Design a protein around this nucleic acid. Structure first.
Ligand code: MG
Ligand code: MG
Ligand code: MG
Length: 799
RNA sequence: UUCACAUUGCCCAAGUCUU
RNA sequence: CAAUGUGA
């Protein structure tokens, strides 16, 4: 239940392709380095303050200690050669513009043992060793640049990327030390994030309040101006030599604001006559004291990342400033590494480390896509080309016959007229007839409505009046709270199928849009759009098997009380195509799925009810777990799956395959040959697979870019097998995973992650919609909100 | 709320110390 | 999913 399986073999399927990865080979010396535990009293200091302390400490004691050590900003210091210490704590006293620093040797870290672990010699990779190398590579940039996670950001020289609102774009790069089949690798990728400009607060006001210049005007701000400004600068730090954090903007101008007025105080003591006394002051420091700074004598301090959400316009600017095709990104990574010059870094060089300046070459394989079987009389077979196919002259494998349906238009009648609805209905019936999902009649019901209050009574009337009602098509004017209400009533209250459509897609229809629309409708009504060509599937389908997709979605940044949402879906046929969903609310920002055992039990029960088979195997696709959570998550969740089986029957012990899916990492793959690049974005082809060189030295993992890259640089999904009772070969599991990317019903394309994992996202996001403005007695309220109706339980409402 | 892809938002990481 | 783009 605890240790991941070794790599069974290497894949052999598919034609080869020359790739370049943003991994850079590291040459590590085979010598012991020396680990020391520090202490710094007081120890509530920010991490960067601790780096200053040790930095000054190193030189302020250079003489009979420290004859170029590295430091993690907390508690760990490393040297390439040993110090004079013994094992003794050597408390030092250091002063920086009153600190006690204790230095104690702890262990010897052998880089020799790392070479063995990267080889077949040692069974596993020693974390503490890679942890040390990480501190070596991060030492310099952690003081030179502004750390954000595993990245480093800085104001770009000579350029300025303003966002407005006192914000601008800082470019940066991600850095991480990784073991691999070949060598140690330095993974480098470029990135960009928003920062507040280091400008006078006076000019910060102008951008926030949209003033061309101050003295526009010379009257104290309106309360509406003062409230907007207070929201932006509160929590931000400002400087004079001495730095404060802003907690409040005073109501009264500096001329009147008394504590002795602020204006007066600065006239006598500091001999400063304020140029804009009519403006308020910044209350800084402790909220329960009376320290007020005029705007004129304050600057926003540099290197403060913008945590708040960007505006629509700010986002739009951010996108344009950082959007890059795959070759363009490739060159920006390359240019960065040449200019980075990691080998002159004195700390990197103290530890005798060398970093390759060229991207690593890696050979991938482009897997063949599966054939997609359709229905109708002809039973057409689609052949994905470059990750895409279409439904033209093809009918659904199992198309639904729609006899009873209705339209509910919440768009204004002037904007969405009966003629519009009629034409839309005309075209939709045409497309749906072609697709093998005939809408036999005009809707038995069609009424306009307004507001969220009209939803439930209308839907209740519909359910009571029209027997055999299959669907309600809901027209929406755009972004409106009605949508969430439609889904609350439909999914959870009354248990009725609904398909919403934006007004603009009714006024002006297209064959493609209407086609995609039918894909959702047919699925929602129990249909089967298409299936994998049966004889083209991997051998695993010879026995009953269920495919589980699982994901947790956490609240946005800055949020503190909203629940995390766990969603799990399971296949309900042998194709596989039909899926049922389970969903739960759980603790804030907890990744481990707490109630998984219960959820899997439901899915296993519903699988048997649907197929009359008991799975002999369980394939578990787990999205979004990082390497630092593999053991924790696997321990709880693998056992939870077993628990579900055991509490059901026997002696029922199906083989479990546990696979972690990671779409969001920092590995990027590029075509070496320009003639391999695909489309305008110039990305690697769909099906590109990498399970060598850059992958894990001992464990079963691979990259699979299963989708066509439309824009930017494609994210190759990474798959890591944490458990496998079924003993998959690399070829079978990679093909299986790839084929499951072709079973996503909402489009005739290969998607970036397997359908079950994708559905899990959709289910989680739907639950989040049921919880809008609603997020023991607390838990049960939220739990009921995400609980769907009895009639919705076995449906694909999430489509 | 036709859909995918891409950027950010999500576990780990990161962050958090005389007017 | 939301914002913003590229696309069908
Ligand atoms: Mg997740
Ligand atoms: Mg943490
Ligand atoms: Mg969007």
């Amino acid at each position: 239940a605890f240790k991941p399986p070794p790599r069974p073999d290497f894949g052999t399927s598919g034609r080869t392709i020359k790739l370049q990865a943003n991994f850079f080979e590291m040459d590590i010396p085979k010598i012991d380095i020396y680990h020391y535990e520090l202490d710094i009293k007081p120890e509530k200091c920010p991490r960067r303050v601790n780096r200053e302390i040790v930095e000054h400490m190193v030189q302020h004691f250079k003489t009979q200690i420290f004859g170029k050590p590295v430091f993690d900003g907390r508690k760990n210091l490393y040297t390439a050669m040993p110090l004079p210490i013994g094992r003794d704590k050597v408390e030092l006293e250091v002063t920086l513009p009153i600190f006690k620093v204790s230095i104690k040797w702890v262990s010897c870290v052998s880089l020799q043992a790392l070479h063995d672990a990267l080889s077949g010699r040692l069974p596993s990779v020693p974390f503490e060793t890679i942890q040390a190398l990480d501190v070596v590579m991060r030492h310099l940039p952690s003081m030179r640049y502004t750390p954000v996670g595993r990245s480093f950001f800085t104001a770009s020289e000579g350029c300025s990327n303003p966002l407005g609102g006192g914000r601008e774009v800082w470019f940066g790069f991600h850095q991480s030390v990784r073991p691999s089949l070949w060598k140690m690798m330095l993974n480098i990728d470029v990135s960009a994030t928003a920062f507040y400009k280091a400008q006078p607060v006076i000019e910060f006001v102008c951008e926030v309040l949209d003033f061309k210049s101050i003295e526009e005007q010379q009257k104290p701000l309106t309360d509406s101006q003062r409230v907007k400004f207070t929201k932006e600068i509160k929590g931000l730090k400002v400087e004079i030599k001495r730095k404060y954090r802003v907690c409040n903007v005073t109501r009264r101008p500096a001329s009147h604001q008394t504590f002795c007025t602020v204006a007066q105080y600065f006239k006598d003591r500091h001999k400063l006559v304020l140029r804009y006394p009519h403006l308020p002051c910044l209350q800084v420091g402790q909220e329960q004291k009376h320290t007020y700074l005029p705007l004129e004598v304050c600057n926003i301090v540099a290197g403060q990342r913008c945590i708040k959400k960007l505006t629509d316009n700010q986002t739009s600017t951010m996108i344009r400033a950082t959007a890059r095709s795959a070759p363009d990104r490739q060159e920006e990574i390359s240019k960065l590494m040449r200019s980075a010059d990691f080998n002159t870094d004195p700390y990197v060089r103290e530890f005798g480390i060398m970093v390759k300046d060229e991207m690593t070459d890696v050979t991938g394989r482009v897997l063949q896509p599966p054939s997609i079987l359709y229905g109708g009389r002809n039973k057409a077979i689609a052949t994905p080309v470059q990750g895409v196919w279409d439904m033209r002259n093809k009918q659904f494998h199992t198309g639904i016959e729609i006899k009873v349906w209705a339209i509910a238009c919440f768009a204004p009648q002037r904007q969405c007229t009966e003629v519009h609805l009629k034409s839309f209905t005309e075209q939709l019936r045409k497309i749906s007839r072609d697709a093998g999902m005939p809408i036999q009649g005009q809707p038995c019901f069609c009424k306009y409505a307004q507001g969220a209050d009209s939803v439930e009574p209308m839907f209740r009337h519909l359910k009571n009046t029209y027997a055999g009602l299959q669907l309600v098509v809901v027209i929406l004017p755009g972004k409106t709270p009605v949508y969430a209400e439609v889904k609350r009533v439909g999914d959870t209250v009354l248990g009725m199928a609904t398909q919403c459509v934006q007004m603009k897609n009714v006024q002006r229809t297209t064959p493609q849009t209407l086609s995609n629309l039918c894909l959702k409708i047919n699925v929602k009504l129990g249909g089967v759009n298409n299936i994998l060509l049966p004889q083209g599937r991997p051998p695993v389908f010879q026995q009953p098997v269920i495919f589980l997709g699982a994901d947790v979605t956490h609240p946005p940044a800055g949020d503190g009380k909203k629940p995390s949402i766990a969603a799990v879906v399971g296949s309900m046929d042998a194709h596989p195509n039909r899926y049922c969903a389970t969903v739960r609310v759980q603790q804030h920002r907890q990744e481990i799925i707490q109630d998984l055992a219960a959820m899997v039990r439901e899915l296993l029960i519903q699988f048997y009810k649907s197929t009359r088979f008991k799975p002999t195997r369980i394939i578990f696709y787990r999205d979004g777990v990082s390497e630092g959570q593999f053991q924790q998550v696997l321990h709880h969740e693998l056992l939870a799956i077993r628990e579900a089986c055991i509490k059901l029957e026997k002696d029922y012990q199906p083989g479990i395959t546990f696979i972690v899916v990671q779409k969001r990492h920092h590995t990027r793959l590029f075509c070496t040959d320009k003639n391999e690049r695909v489309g305008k974005s110039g990305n690697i082809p769909a099906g590109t697979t990498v399970d060598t060189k850059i992958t894990h030295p001992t464990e079963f993992d691979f990259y699979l870019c299963s989708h066509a890259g439309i824009q930017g640089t494609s994210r190759p999904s990474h798959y890591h097998v944490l458990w496998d009772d079924n003993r998959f070969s690399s070829d079978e599991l990679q093909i299986l995973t790839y084929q499951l990317c072709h079973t996503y019903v909402r489009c005739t394309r290969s998607v970036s992650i397997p359908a079950p994992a994708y559905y899990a996202h959709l289910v989680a996001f739907r639950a989040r919609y049921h919880l809008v403005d609603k997020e023991g007695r607390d838990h049960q309220a939220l739990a009921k909100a995400v609980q769907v109706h009895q009639d919705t339980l076995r449906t694909m409402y999430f489509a």
